[PDB]
Nucleic acid binder design. Structure first.
Ligand code: HG
Length: 111
DNA sequence: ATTCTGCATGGAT
DNA sequence: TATCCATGCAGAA
């Protein structure tokens, strides 16, 4: 059958996202809009392939923030290093239709 | 000291 | 006023 890659959204890494803590923050709008919906704080494990085949597995989860939710992927440090990534570079998420498989990529900062 | 948690804050807009 | 995510910041180990 016929296949296509739908871009979902991107995230320009912050220091907090890029450093040692291992959590990459997702803006709520984007999280709820493009990832599986989730009803509990401690969310689900989420598998994302990269261009060169490799599956990564993060916990996709959130906490109560104000009267809403703040969202994150936990356990990302391996992947960031593997991709030689820093604050200011950018990660792009993307979906493959039909079937809705999640994949990812990144690019270096503008300089 | 250190890393991990689980939020809460407040700066930026 | 409001929103909200980058970073603070305390337990707990
Ligand atoms: Hg990654």
């Amino acid at each position: 059958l016929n296949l296509n890659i739908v871009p979902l959204f991107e995230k320009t890494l912050s220091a907090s996202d890029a450093g040692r803590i291992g959590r990459l923050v997702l803006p709520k709008a984007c999280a709820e809009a493009y990832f599986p919906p989730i009803s509990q704080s401690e969310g689900i494990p989420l598998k994302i392939q990269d261009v060169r085949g490799r599956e990564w597995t993060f916990q996709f989860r959130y906490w109560p923030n104000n009267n809403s939710r703040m969202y994150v992927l936990e356990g990302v440090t391996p992947c960031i290093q593997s991709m030689m990534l820093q604050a200011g570079d950018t990660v792009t998420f993307s979906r493959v239709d039909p079937g809705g498989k999640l994949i990812m990529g990144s690019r270096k900062a503008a300089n």
